[PDB]
């Protein structure tokens, strides 16, 4: 199993280091791939490291800049990115396949997103949307949050049925914002709870909200 870490926001020109920790046994045959995906674009192979020596192969998009290392006992791999551009804003995955020796299975991480801009980290300002006779709808609107991502799952997974959470829109002010909605019984008078399950990872802003007509 693969887990990435070390994301966040970085200033153009400044640098950041990402970690990829693997679980299980480790053979000298094994290795590690780094693949990134820009917001709304395709996949791009960044580099590979091979544990059986000095061989590291980079993409010409990052050659001479990105550097990959590891320590064996921690079973982690690092990629220190430097001289970052806006073009390098992407979700970064580490990956191993069985079909070329890098790993025992075709493993991927969850990906951690790095964003390259001088904008500052800001917590989300959530607001309720009152439903006020036909199946009703209600929601939380998250406003002025930077950078992505954000997660919501009403009632902490208790009421997660037929919920649409629209992708974030980038307001020209520079702050993302979105909202989520749940269609609910027509007259759900005095329902148990409706907890705004919103968490911002970059800014530790875990918040909850009431949605009562």
């Amino acid at each position: 199993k693969l887990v990435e870490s070390g994301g966040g926001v970085v200033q153009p020109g400044r640098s950041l280091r990402l970690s990829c920790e693997a679980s299980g046994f480790i053979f000298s045959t094994y290795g590690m791939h780094w693949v990134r995906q820009a917001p709304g674009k395709g996949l791009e192979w960044v580099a590979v490291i091979w544990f059986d020596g000095s061989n590291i192969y980079y993409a010409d998009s990052v050659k001479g800049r990105f550097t990959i290392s590891r320590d064996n006992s921690k079973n982690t791999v690092f990629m220190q990115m430097d001289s970052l551009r806006a073009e390098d804003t992407a979700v970064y995955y580490c990956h191993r396949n069985f079909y070329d020796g890098s790993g025992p299975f075709d493993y991927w991480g969850q990906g951690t997103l790095v964003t390259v801009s001088s904008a500052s980290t800001k917590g989300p300002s959530v607001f309720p949307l009152a439903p006020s006779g036909g199946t009703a709808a209600l929601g939380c609107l998250v406003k002025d949050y930077f950078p992505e991502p954000v997660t919501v799952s009403w009632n902490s997974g208790a009421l997660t049925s037929g919920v649409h959470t629209f992708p974030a829109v980038l307001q020209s002010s520079g702050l993302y914002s979105l909202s989520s909605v749940v269609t609910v019984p027509s007259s759900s008078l005095g329902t148990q709870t409706y907890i705004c399950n919103v968490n911002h990872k970059p800014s530790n802003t875990k918040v909850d909200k009431k949605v009562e007509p």
Partner: protein, 212 residues
């Protein structure tokens, strides 16, 4: 080295045969793999060695090809199979990927259920009011939505976001937000969003009055 992936986007209903072509700029033998990536999640191996099938991936998925021409075939398409599919070559030191291919399902039209939401009092003490109009569970994607403020058509003060096609009912849901100042919200009374869609025969309008 370049992987040419065709088409860029295709649509088909459930039970259809779907073929995605990946053309290789050079001889890559059979060192080609096919991945599936659903929105928000990491990729998933479908096929390796051009035709070999992964573990836990159904026999509806098949791969064939050799040399420079390769094809990924989905015999019967299922609604949970909406995702982006890519080709990767592992012939040498580096890995070259494909442009990708977006898949979405066709279905008989579903009428959008519209809801109006006034801005909350908490967002009015901030100084910036936001009114949102929600269209729920509809197909196709294309829907118009006009904002009226005191019976006057608004323009340049709205932005729209559509969800990804739901993996069960295969319907989209559109949100539309309207932003103005607290003074501009206090200076008017009647706020309405008129939506038009292929499913509804007549444009359906939902509105509220500031104060009721």
């Amino acid at each position: 080295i370049q992987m040419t992936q065709s088409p860029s986007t295709l649509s088909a209903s459930v039970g259809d045969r779907v073929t995605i072509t990946c053309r290789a700029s050079q001889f890559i033998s059979r060192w080609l793999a096919w991945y599936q990536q659903k929105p928000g999640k990491a990729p998933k191996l479908l096929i390796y060695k051009a035709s070999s099938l992964e573990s836990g991936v159904p026999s509806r998925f098949s791969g064939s090809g050799s040399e420079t021409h390769f094809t990924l075939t989905i015999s019967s398409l299922q609604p949970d199979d909406v995702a982006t599919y890519y080709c990767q070559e592992y012939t040498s030191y580096g890995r070259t990927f494909g442009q990708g291919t977006k898949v979405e399902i066709k279905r008989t039209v579903a009428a959008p259920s519209v809801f109006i939401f006034p801005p909350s009092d908490e967002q009015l003490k901030s100084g910036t009011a936001s009114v949102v109009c929600l269209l729920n569970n509809f197909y196709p994607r294309e829907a118009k939505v006009q904002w009226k403020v005191d019976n006057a058509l608004q323009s340049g003060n709205s932005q729209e976001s559509v969800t990804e096609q739901d993996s069960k009912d295969s319907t989209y849901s559109l949100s539309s937000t309207l932003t103005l100042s607290k003074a501009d919200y206090e200076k008017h009374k009647v706020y309405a969003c008129e939506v038009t869609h292929q499913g509804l025969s007549s444009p359906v309008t939902k509105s509220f009055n500031r104060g009721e």
